[PDB]
Amino acid sequence: SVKSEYAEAAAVGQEAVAVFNTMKAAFQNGDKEAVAQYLARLASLYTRHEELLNRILEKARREGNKEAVTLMNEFTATFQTGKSIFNAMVAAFKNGDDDSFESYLQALEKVTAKGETLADQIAKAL
Ligand SMILES: Nc1nc2ccc(Br)cc2s1
Ligand SMILES: Nc1nc2ccc(Br)cc2s1
């Protein structure tokens, strides 16, 4: 079902939360070799999440589930805010700009925490 597909997508999202927190600890500790690997693991996770979310939105549209489509349009837009912040963070790491890396890291945390009440609302709507 689209609802079980969203639960799968939500788990992939939680996996990225877990890896992100590990990556934050590694960054604070200066373990740049770990950070590089965690960033790659986050890129693949977000890429997958982005796809599951698109398939769910397209399916809700085909089903005519107007409320779920509204929420998923708002959610995917917020997801892209997070994706842009993540990508700038990766660039800051490549550039050795720890000040920018820190800024992007906190911003991605805030963008993410805000989008949580909507994440739950989508589960109920599908
Ligand atoms: N294609 C995408 N890459 C990312 C990276 C981080 C976050 Br948050 C969302 C996305 S969507
Ligand atoms: N529960 C939630 N998971 C996510 C993932 C990415 C972004 Br951006 C916001 C949220 S809110």
Side-chain angles (χ1 to χ4, degrees), residues 6 13-14 17 46 49 75 78-83 108 111-117 119-120:
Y6 186 74
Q14 284 314 109
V17 167
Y46 293 137
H49 199 187
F75 194 74
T78 294
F79 177 100
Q80 293 292 317
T81 306
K83 174 185 180 172
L108 184 60
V111 149
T112 298
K114 289 186 173 64
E116 283 319 320
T117 50
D120 275 16

PDB file of all heavy atoms in Angstrom, residues 6 13-14 17 46 49 75 78-83 108 111-117 119-120, ligand 2:
ATOM      1  N   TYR A   6       5.103   4.458   2.653  1.00  0.00           N
ATOM      2  CA  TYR A   6       5.540   5.627   3.418  1.00  0.00           C
ATOM      3  C   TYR A   6       6.271   5.193   4.686  1.00  0.00           C
ATOM      4  O   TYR A   6       7.278   5.805   5.075  1.00  0.00           O
ATOM      5  CB  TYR A   6       4.354   6.552   3.731  1.00  0.00           C
ATOM      6  CG  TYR A   6       4.792   7.855   4.393  1.00  0.00           C
ATOM      7  CD1 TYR A   6       5.414   8.852   3.649  1.00  0.00           C
ATOM      8  CD2 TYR A   6       4.605   8.064   5.746  1.00  0.00           C
ATOM      9  CE1 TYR A   6       5.854  10.038   4.243  1.00  0.00           C
ATOM     10  CE2 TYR A   6       5.028   9.250   6.358  1.00  0.00           C
ATOM     11  CZ  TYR A   6       5.651  10.237   5.598  1.00  0.00           C
ATOM     12  OH  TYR A   6       6.080  11.423   6.187  1.00  0.00           O
ATOM     13  N   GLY A  13      14.446   7.519   6.174  1.00  0.00           N
ATOM     14  CA  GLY A  13      14.679   8.811   6.791  1.00  0.00           C
ATOM     15  C   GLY A  13      15.319   8.715   8.171  1.00  0.00           C
ATOM     16  O   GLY A  13      16.241   9.479   8.491  1.00  0.00           O
ATOM     17  N   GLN A  14      14.824   7.794   9.023  1.00  0.00           N
ATOM     18  CA  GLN A  14      15.408   7.623  10.350  1.00  0.00           C
ATOM     19  C   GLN A  14      16.826   7.085  10.282  1.00  0.00           C
ATOM     20  O   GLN A  14      17.648   7.424  11.150  1.00  0.00           O
ATOM     21  CB  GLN A  14      14.559   6.701  11.238  1.00  0.00           C
ATOM     22  CG  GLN A  14      13.307   7.390  11.770  1.00  0.00           C
ATOM     23  CD  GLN A  14      13.623   8.782  12.314  1.00  0.00           C
ATOM     24  OE1 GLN A  14      13.256   9.800  11.720  1.00  0.00           O
ATOM     25  NE2 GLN A  14      14.359   8.826  13.421  1.00  0.00           N
ATOM     26  N   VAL A  17      18.922  10.027   9.880  1.00  0.00           N
ATOM     27  CA  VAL A  17      19.073  10.742  11.148  1.00  0.00           C
ATOM     28  C   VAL A  17      20.161  10.089  11.985  1.00  0.00           C
ATOM     29  O   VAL A  17      21.022  10.762  12.570  1.00  0.00           O
ATOM     30  CB  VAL A  17      17.729  10.782  11.896  1.00  0.00           C
ATOM     31  CG1 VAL A  17      17.933  11.226  13.324  1.00  0.00           C
ATOM     32  CG2 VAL A  17      16.774  11.725  11.199  1.00  0.00           C
ATOM     33  N   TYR A  46      19.833   9.924   1.214  1.00  0.00           N
ATOM     34  CA  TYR A  46      18.948  10.994   0.768  1.00  0.00           C
ATOM     35  C   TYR A  46      18.485  10.763  -0.660  1.00  0.00           C
ATOM     36  O   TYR A  46      17.316  11.011  -0.992  1.00  0.00           O
ATOM     37  CB  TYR A  46      19.659  12.345   0.878  1.00  0.00           C
ATOM     38  CG  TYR A  46      19.952  12.784   2.290  1.00  0.00           C
ATOM     39  CD1 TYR A  46      21.171  13.349   2.615  1.00  0.00           C
ATOM     40  CD2 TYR A  46      19.011  12.631   3.298  1.00  0.00           C
ATOM     41  CE1 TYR A  46      21.452  13.755   3.902  1.00  0.00           C
ATOM     42  CE2 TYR A  46      19.280  13.029   4.591  1.00  0.00           C
ATOM     43  CZ  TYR A  46      20.502  13.605   4.886  1.00  0.00           C
ATOM     44  OH  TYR A  46      20.779  14.010   6.173  1.00  0.00           O
ATOM     45  N   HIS A  49      15.765   8.190  -0.337  1.00  0.00           N
ATOM     46  CA  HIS A  49      14.598   8.804   0.287  1.00  0.00           C
ATOM     47  C   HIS A  49      13.864   9.680  -0.720  1.00  0.00           C
ATOM     48  O   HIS A  49      12.646   9.577  -0.887  1.00  0.00           O
ATOM     49  CB  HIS A  49      15.025   9.620   1.513  1.00  0.00           C
ATOM     50  CG  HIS A  49      13.911   9.916   2.473  1.00  0.00           C
ATOM     51  ND1 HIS A  49      14.066  10.748   3.561  1.00  0.00           N
ATOM     52  CD2 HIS A  49      12.635   9.465   2.525  1.00  0.00           C
ATOM     53  CE1 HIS A  49      12.926  10.814   4.227  1.00  0.00           C
ATOM     54  NE2 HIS A  49      12.044  10.044   3.620  1.00  0.00           N
ATOM     55  N   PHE A  75       5.847  18.811   1.913  1.00  0.00           N
ATOM     56  CA  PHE A  75       6.941  18.060   2.524  1.00  0.00           C
ATOM     57  C   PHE A  75       8.127  17.946   1.578  1.00  0.00           C
ATOM     58  O   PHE A  75       9.278  18.161   1.983  1.00  0.00           O
ATOM     59  CB  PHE A  75       6.442  16.670   2.921  1.00  0.00           C
ATOM     60  CG  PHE A  75       7.364  15.921   3.851  1.00  0.00           C
ATOM     61  CD1 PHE A  75       7.464  16.277   5.185  1.00  0.00           C
ATOM     62  CD2 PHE A  75       8.100  14.842   3.394  1.00  0.00           C
ATOM     63  CE1 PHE A  75       8.295  15.588   6.041  1.00  0.00           C
ATOM     64  CE2 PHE A  75       8.928  14.131   4.251  1.00  0.00           C
ATOM     65  CZ  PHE A  75       9.023  14.508   5.577  1.00  0.00           C
ATOM     66  N   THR A  78      10.073  21.083   1.496  1.00  0.00           N
ATOM     67  CA  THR A  78      10.951  21.197   2.652  1.00  0.00           C
ATOM     68  C   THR A  78      12.127  20.237   2.538  1.00  0.00           C
ATOM     69  O   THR A  78      13.253  20.586   2.915  1.00  0.00           O
ATOM     70  CB  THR A  78      10.176  20.955   3.948  1.00  0.00           C
ATOM     71  OG1 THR A  78       9.227  22.005   4.125  1.00  0.00           O
ATOM     72  CG2 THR A  78      11.133  20.923   5.152  1.00  0.00           C
ATOM     73  N   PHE A  79      11.891  19.021   2.030  1.00  0.00           N
ATOM     74  CA  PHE A  79      12.988  18.088   1.781  1.00  0.00           C
ATOM     75  C   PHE A  79      14.064  18.729   0.906  1.00  0.00           C
ATOM     76  O   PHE A  79      15.264  18.614   1.195  1.00  0.00           O
ATOM     77  CB  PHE A  79      12.450  16.795   1.134  1.00  0.00           C
ATOM     78  CG  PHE A  79      13.526  15.789   0.778  1.00  0.00           C
ATOM     79  CD1 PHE A  79      13.788  14.705   1.608  1.00  0.00           C
ATOM     80  CD2 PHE A  79      14.288  15.934  -0.369  1.00  0.00           C
ATOM     81  CE1 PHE A  79      14.781  13.792   1.300  1.00  0.00           C
ATOM     82  CE2 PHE A  79      15.290  15.028  -0.676  1.00  0.00           C
ATOM     83  CZ  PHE A  79      15.544  13.960   0.162  1.00  0.00           C
ATOM     84  N   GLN A  80      13.653  19.456  -0.140  1.00  0.00           N
ATOM     85  CA  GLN A  80      14.638  20.079  -1.024  1.00  0.00           C
ATOM     86  C   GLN A  80      15.406  21.192  -0.315  1.00  0.00           C
ATOM     87  O   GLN A  80      16.576  21.432  -0.626  1.00  0.00           O
ATOM     88  CB  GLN A  80      13.961  20.621  -2.289  1.00  0.00           C
ATOM     89  CG  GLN A  80      13.384  19.546  -3.198  1.00  0.00           C
ATOM     90  CD  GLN A  80      14.439  18.669  -3.869  1.00  0.00           C
ATOM     91  OE1 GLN A  80      15.467  19.150  -4.355  1.00  0.00           O
ATOM     92  NE2 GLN A  80      14.172  17.361  -3.910  1.00  0.00           N
ATOM     93  N   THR A  81      14.778  21.874   0.642  1.00  0.00           N
ATOM     94  CA  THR A  81      15.538  22.799   1.484  1.00  0.00           C
ATOM     95  C   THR A  81      16.640  22.061   2.230  1.00  0.00           C
ATOM     96  O   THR A  81      17.793  22.505   2.268  1.00  0.00           O
ATOM     97  CB  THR A  81      14.598  23.502   2.460  1.00  0.00           C
ATOM     98  OG1 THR A  81      13.546  24.116   1.714  1.00  0.00           O
ATOM     99  CG2 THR A  81      15.352  24.560   3.288  1.00  0.00           C
ATOM    100  N   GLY A  82      16.299  20.926   2.828  1.00  0.00           N
ATOM    101  CA  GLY A  82      17.310  20.140   3.509  1.00  0.00           C
ATOM    102  C   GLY A  82      18.396  19.655   2.565  1.00  0.00           C
ATOM    103  O   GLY A  82      19.577  19.633   2.920  1.00  0.00           O
ATOM    104  N   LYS A  83      18.006  19.233   1.361  1.00  0.00           N
ATOM    105  CA  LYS A  83      18.978  18.737   0.393  1.00  0.00           C
ATOM    106  C   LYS A  83      19.959  19.829  -0.023  1.00  0.00           C
ATOM    107  O   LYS A  83      21.151  19.563  -0.186  1.00  0.00           O
ATOM    108  CB  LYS A  83      18.251  18.144  -0.821  1.00  0.00           C
ATOM    109  CG  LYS A  83      19.159  17.723  -1.972  1.00  0.00           C
ATOM    110  CD  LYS A  83      18.353  17.266  -3.183  1.00  0.00           C
ATOM    111  CE  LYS A  83      19.266  16.837  -4.324  1.00  0.00           C
ATOM    112  NZ  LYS A  83      18.499  16.215  -5.452  1.00  0.00           N
ATOM    113  N   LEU A 108      20.612  22.357   8.918  1.00  0.00           N
ATOM    114  CA  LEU A 108      19.977  21.121   8.470  1.00  0.00           C
ATOM    115  C   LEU A 108      19.256  20.425   9.615  1.00  0.00           C
ATOM    116  O   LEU A 108      18.237  19.755   9.394  1.00  0.00           O
ATOM    117  CB  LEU A 108      21.020  20.189   7.851  1.00  0.00           C
ATOM    118  CG  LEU A 108      20.477  18.889   7.260  1.00  0.00           C
ATOM    119  CD1 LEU A 108      19.492  19.200   6.178  1.00  0.00           C
ATOM    120  CD2 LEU A 108      21.590  18.042   6.705  1.00  0.00           C
ATOM    121  N   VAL A 111      15.894  22.734   9.986  1.00  0.00           N
ATOM    122  CA  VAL A 111      15.001  22.416   8.874  1.00  0.00           C
ATOM    123  C   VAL A 111      14.354  21.055   9.085  1.00  0.00           C
ATOM    124  O   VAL A 111      13.168  20.857   8.781  1.00  0.00           O
ATOM    125  CB  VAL A 111      15.784  22.468   7.547  1.00  0.00           C
ATOM    126  CG1 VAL A 111      15.223  21.478   6.532  1.00  0.00           C
ATOM    127  CG2 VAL A 111      15.787  23.890   6.993  1.00  0.00           C
ATOM    128  N   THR A 112      15.122  20.097   9.601  1.00  0.00           N
ATOM    129  CA  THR A 112      14.624  18.735   9.774  1.00  0.00           C
ATOM    130  C   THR A 112      13.636  18.649  10.927  1.00  0.00           C
ATOM    131  O   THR A 112      12.562  18.052  10.795  1.00  0.00           O
ATOM    132  CB  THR A 112      15.798  17.792  10.008  1.00  0.00           C
ATOM    133  OG1 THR A 112      16.637  17.815   8.850  1.00  0.00           O
ATOM    134  CG2 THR A 112      15.315  16.369  10.263  1.00  0.00           C
ATOM    135  N   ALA A 113      13.992  19.226  12.075  1.00  0.00           N
ATOM    136  CA  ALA A 113      13.118  19.159  13.239  1.00  0.00           C
ATOM    137  C   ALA A 113      11.783  19.841  12.961  1.00  0.00           C
ATOM    138  O   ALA A 113      10.733  19.377  13.422  1.00  0.00           O
ATOM    139  CB  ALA A 113      13.812  19.787  14.448  1.00  0.00           C
ATOM    140  N   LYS A 114      11.803  20.950  12.209  1.00  0.00           N
ATOM    141  CA  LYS A 114      10.560  21.632  11.866  1.00  0.00           C
ATOM    142  C   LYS A 114       9.644  20.725  11.059  1.00  0.00           C
ATOM    143  O   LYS A 114       8.434  20.665  11.311  1.00  0.00           O
ATOM    144  CB  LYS A 114      10.848  22.915  11.082  1.00  0.00           C
ATOM    145  CG  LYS A 114      11.482  24.045  11.890  1.00  0.00           C
ATOM    146  CD  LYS A 114      11.583  25.318  11.047  1.00  0.00           C
ATOM    147  CE  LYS A 114      12.053  26.516  11.865  1.00  0.00           C
ATOM    148  NZ  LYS A 114      13.434  26.342  12.396  1.00  0.00           N
ATOM    149  N   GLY A 115      10.201  19.997  10.100  1.00  0.00           N
ATOM    150  CA  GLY A 115       9.399  19.222   9.179  1.00  0.00           C
ATOM    151  C   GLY A 115       8.835  17.945   9.744  1.00  0.00           C
ATOM    152  O   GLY A 115       8.257  17.148   8.998  1.00  0.00           O
ATOM    153  N   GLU A 116       8.955  17.733  11.053  1.00  0.00           N
ATOM    154  CA  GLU A 116       8.563  16.454  11.637  1.00  0.00           C
ATOM    155  C   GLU A 116       7.061  16.347  11.847  1.00  0.00           C
ATOM    156  O   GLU A 116       6.468  15.297  11.575  1.00  0.00           O
ATOM    157  CB  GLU A 116       9.300  16.228  12.960  1.00  0.00           C
ATOM    158  CG  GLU A 116      10.749  15.806  12.777  1.00  0.00           C
ATOM    159  CD  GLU A 116      10.935  14.798  11.653  1.00  0.00           C
ATOM    160  OE1 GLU A 116      10.075  13.895  11.516  1.00  0.00           O
ATOM    161  OE2 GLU A 116      11.927  14.914  10.902  1.00  0.00           O
ATOM    162  N   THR A 117       6.422  17.410  12.330  1.00  0.00           N
ATOM    163  CA  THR A 117       4.980  17.331  12.537  1.00  0.00           C
ATOM    164  C   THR A 117       4.253  17.043  11.229  1.00  0.00           C
ATOM    165  O   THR A 117       3.262  16.309  11.216  1.00  0.00           O
ATOM    166  CB  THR A 117       4.473  18.619  13.185  1.00  0.00           C
ATOM    167  OG1 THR A 117       4.955  19.752  12.451  1.00  0.00           O
ATOM    168  CG2 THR A 117       4.959  18.709  14.631  1.00  0.00           C
ATOM    169  N   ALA A 119       5.677  15.344   8.690  1.00  0.00           N
ATOM    170  CA  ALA A 119       5.979  13.948   8.395  1.00  0.00           C
ATOM    171  C   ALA A 119       4.943  13.022   9.026  1.00  0.00           C
ATOM    172  O   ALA A 119       4.422  12.101   8.377  1.00  0.00           O
ATOM    173  CB  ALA A 119       7.390  13.614   8.888  1.00  0.00           C
ATOM    174  N   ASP A 120       4.618  13.256  10.300  1.00  0.00           N
ATOM    175  CA  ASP A 120       3.585  12.448  10.939  1.00  0.00           C
ATOM    176  C   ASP A 120       2.228  12.665  10.276  1.00  0.00           C
ATOM    177  O   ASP A 120       1.491  11.701  10.029  1.00  0.00           O
ATOM    178  CB  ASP A 120       3.516  12.759  12.435  1.00  0.00           C
ATOM    179  CG  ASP A 120       4.525  11.964  13.250  1.00  0.00           C
ATOM    180  OD1 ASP A 120       5.477  11.395  12.667  1.00  0.00           O
ATOM    181  OD2 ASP A 120       4.348  11.888  14.482  1.00  0.00           O
TER     182      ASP A 120
HETATM  183  N1  LIG B   2      10.411  13.413  10.326  1.00  0.00           N
HETATM  184  C1  LIG B   2      11.160  14.015   9.405  1.00  0.00           C
HETATM  185  N2  LIG B   2      12.055  13.534   8.590  1.00  0.00           N
HETATM  186  C2  LIG B   2      12.664  14.501   7.730  1.00  0.00           C
HETATM  187  C3  LIG B   2      13.628  14.384   6.765  1.00  0.00           C
HETATM  188  C4  LIG B   2      14.093  15.433   6.044  1.00  0.00           C
HETATM  189  C5  LIG B   2      13.545  16.692   6.297  1.00  0.00           C
HETATM  190 BR1  LIG B   2      14.197  18.185   5.286  1.00  0.00          BR
HETATM  191  C6  LIG B   2      12.588  16.883   7.237  1.00  0.00           C
HETATM  192  C7  LIG B   2      12.111  15.836   7.982  1.00  0.00           C
HETATM  193  S1  LIG B   2      10.929  15.830   9.223  1.00  0.00           S
END
